[PDB]
Design a protein around this motif. Structure first.
Motif, PDB file in Angstrom:
ATOM      1  N   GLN A 245      -1.449   6.623   0.561  1.00  0.00           N
ATOM      2  CA  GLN A 245      -1.119   5.185   0.608  1.00  0.00           C
ATOM      3  C   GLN A 245      -2.597   4.437   0.772  1.00  0.00           C
ATOM      4  OE1 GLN A 245       2.078   5.780   3.414  1.00  0.00           O
ATOM      5  NE2 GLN A 245       3.647   5.355   1.830  1.00  0.00           N
ATOM      6  N   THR A 246      -2.609   3.164   0.441  1.00  0.00           N
ATOM      7  CA  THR A 246      -3.770   2.388   0.411  1.00  0.00           C
ATOM      8  C   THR A 246      -3.581   1.730   1.725  1.00  0.00           C
ATOM      9  OG1 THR A 246      -3.014   0.782  -1.202  1.00  0.00           O
ATOM     10  CG2 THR A 246      -4.203   2.918  -1.946  1.00  0.00           C
ATOM     11  N   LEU A 247      -3.805   2.030   2.992  1.00  0.00           N
ATOM     12  CA  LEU A 247      -3.459   1.305   3.936  1.00  0.00           C
ATOM     13  C   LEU A 247      -4.497   0.661   4.775  1.00  0.00           C
ATOM     14  CD1 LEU A 247      -0.602   3.862   5.335  1.00  0.00           C
ATOM     15  CD2 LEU A 247      -0.216   1.647   4.151  1.00  0.00           C
TER      16      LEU A 247
ATOM     17  N   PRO B 227       1.225   3.123  -4.142  1.00  0.00           N
ATOM     18  CA  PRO B 227       0.423   2.787  -4.977  1.00  0.00           C
ATOM     19  C   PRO B 227       0.143   3.512  -6.389  1.00  0.00           C
ATOM     20  CG  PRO B 227      -0.627   4.460  -3.421  1.00  0.00           C
ATOM     21  CD  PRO B 227       1.167   3.906  -2.954  1.00  0.00           C
TER      22      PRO B 227
ATOM     23  N   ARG C 178      -7.623   0.666  -5.997  1.00  0.00           N
ATOM     24  CA  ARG C 178      -7.762  -0.443  -5.179  1.00  0.00           C
ATOM     25  C   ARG C 178      -6.618  -0.300  -4.328  1.00  0.00           C
ATOM     26  NH1 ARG C 178      -6.782  -2.202 -10.654  1.00  0.00           N
ATOM     27  NH2 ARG C 178      -5.062  -3.319 -10.800  1.00  0.00           N
ATOM     28  N   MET C 179      -6.480  -1.457  -3.490  1.00  0.00           N
ATOM     29  CA  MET C 179      -4.990  -1.859  -2.855  1.00  0.00           C
ATOM     30  C   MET C 179      -3.951  -1.783  -3.815  1.00  0.00           C
ATOM     31  SD  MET C 179      -3.500  -2.329  -0.027  1.00  0.00           S
ATOM     32  CE  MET C 179      -4.603  -2.961   1.194  1.00  0.00           C
ATOM     33  N   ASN C 180      -2.846  -0.920  -3.459  1.00  0.00           N
ATOM     34  CA  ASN C 180      -1.798  -0.888  -4.330  1.00  0.00           C
ATOM     35  C   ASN C 180      -2.120  -0.073  -5.867  1.00  0.00           C
ATOM     36  OD1 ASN C 180       0.291  -1.944  -2.625  1.00  0.00           O
ATOM     37  ND2 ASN C 180      -0.608  -3.658  -2.888  1.00  0.00           N
ATOM     38  N   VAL C 181      -3.076   0.497  -6.005  1.00  0.00           N
ATOM     39  CA  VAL C 181      -3.424   1.134  -7.132  1.00  0.00           C
ATOM     40  C   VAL C 181      -4.289   2.609  -6.886  1.00  0.00           C
ATOM     41  CG1 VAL C 181      -4.418   1.287  -9.564  1.00  0.00           C
ATOM     42  CG2 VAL C 181      -3.785  -1.010  -8.163  1.00  0.00           C
TER      43      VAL C 181
ATOM     44  N   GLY D 290       0.758  -1.220  -0.010  1.00  0.00           N
ATOM     45  CA  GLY D 290      -0.134   0.052  -0.113  1.00  0.00           C
ATOM     46  C   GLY D 290       0.949   1.370  -0.055  1.00  0.00           C
TER      47      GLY D 290
ATOM     48  N   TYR E  15     -10.277   6.223  -2.687  1.00  0.00           N
ATOM     49  CA  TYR E  15      -8.740   6.549  -3.141  1.00  0.00           C
ATOM     50  C   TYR E  15      -8.438   7.802  -3.733  1.00  0.00           C
ATOM     51  CZ  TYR E  15      -9.307   1.117  -2.591  1.00  0.00           C
ATOM     52  OH  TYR E  15      -9.240   0.022  -2.401  1.00  0.00           O
TER      53      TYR E  15
END
Ligand SMILES: C[N+](C)(C)CCCN1C(=O)[C@@H]2[C@H](C1=O)[C@H](c1ncc(-c3ccc(Cl)s3)o1)N1CCC[C@@H]21
Ligand code: NA
Ligand code: NA
Lengths: 233, 54
Positions: B49-51, A13, A101-104, A10, B44
């Protein structure tokens, strides 16, 4: 990336990877929105044809979150020059939109004057990619990041065998063995401000990687914020 | 009041007026009622960060 550390889940991203005819990464990019990727113009000459992968942290493992996007339009800066790498910037419009999304997720584009007074005046920025782990080495299969100090322009120019234009800035270390490297170029240089990451650079060039007395050279995104906006319509 | 001290208390962008500061935010955020904070409009937002695994 030479030195630094693996990106944690994460934490990077906005990283994109340009993949050549083989699904081998050769350059990075930065996710700007669902349809647009920021990269280096010089990356456009490195493979005849390429696609864009997002959501990848490990190129030897299928996590399930990865996606590949084809390029609809390449928007290369019309003053890009291979001789000097001046104006080393391009935007790619994708044929299909990214699903965040997660990591994007996208990195933020800052307002220019505030970026100059507030971001470029920070001690450090962060560079990331899948590039070589030392100058003569191999590419990392895992996404890495690295904190790189901003380097003042005068020191930058003295250190360089090639012209540093006002569309470029230096970052990294004089002698400490940490730098971006081959395979990172086109990727993100971002600067943190109160837990939000803003686009500040594009990995552009270096005289080798992590050499003593040399720095990493980055496209100065502040000079191109209006150009990016126009390019994205 | 000045952008050079604690970024004018702004979460993101700060610009000075004659006497005051004005805060603003990147696309995907709305400036909060207090005139300082930046509130994401979606899950998003840029630069985060996508935590929080949704
Ligand atoms: C004088 N210049 C024409 C500007 C030198 C450009 C050299 N340049 C390339 O030709 C590119 C890029 C690079 O630095 C790239 C590269 N090597 C080192 C690095 C970097 C080190 C630190 C960075 Cl920040 S970017 O980038 N090379 C590996 C594949 C293509 C070729
Ligand atoms: Na993977
Ligand atoms: Na160095």
């Amino acid at each position: 990336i030479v030195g630094g550390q693996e990106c944690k889940d994460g934490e990077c991203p906005w990283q994109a990877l340009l993949i050549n005819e083989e699904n081998e990464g050769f350059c990075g990019g930065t996710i700007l929105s669902e349809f647009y990727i920021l990269t280096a113009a010089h990356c456009l000459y490195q493979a005849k044809r390429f696609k864009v992968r997002v959501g990848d942290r490990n190129t030897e493992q299928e996590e399930g979150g990865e996606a590949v996007h084809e390029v609809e339009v390449v928007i290369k800066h019309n003053r890009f020059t291979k001789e000097t790498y001046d104006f080393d910037i391009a935007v790619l419009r994708l044929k299909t939109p990214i699903t965040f999304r997660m990591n994007v997720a996208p990195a933020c584009l800052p307002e220019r004057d505030w970026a100059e007074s507030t971001l470029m005046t920070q001690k450090t920025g962060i560079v990331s990619g899948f590039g070589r782990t030392h100058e003569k080495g191999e590419q990392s299969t895992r996404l890495k990041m690295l904190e790189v100090p901003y380097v003042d322009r005068n020191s930058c120019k003295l250190s360089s065998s090639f012209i540093i234009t006002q569309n470029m800035f230096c970052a990294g270390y004089d002698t400490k063995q940490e730098d971006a490297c081959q395979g990172d170029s086109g990727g993100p240089h971002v600067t943190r401000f109160k837990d939000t990451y803003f686009v500040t650079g594009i990995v552009s060039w270096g005289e080798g990687c992590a050499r003593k007395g040399k720095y990493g050279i980055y496209t100065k995104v502040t000079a191109f914020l209006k150009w990016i906006d126009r390019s994205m319509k | 009041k000045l952008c050079s001290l604690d970024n004018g208390d702004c979460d993101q962008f700060c610009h000075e007026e004659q006497n005051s500061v004005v805060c603003s935010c990147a696309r995907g955020y709305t400036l909060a009622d207090n005139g300082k904070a930046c509130i994401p409009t979606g899950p998003y937002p840029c630069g985060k960060q996508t935590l929080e695994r949704r």
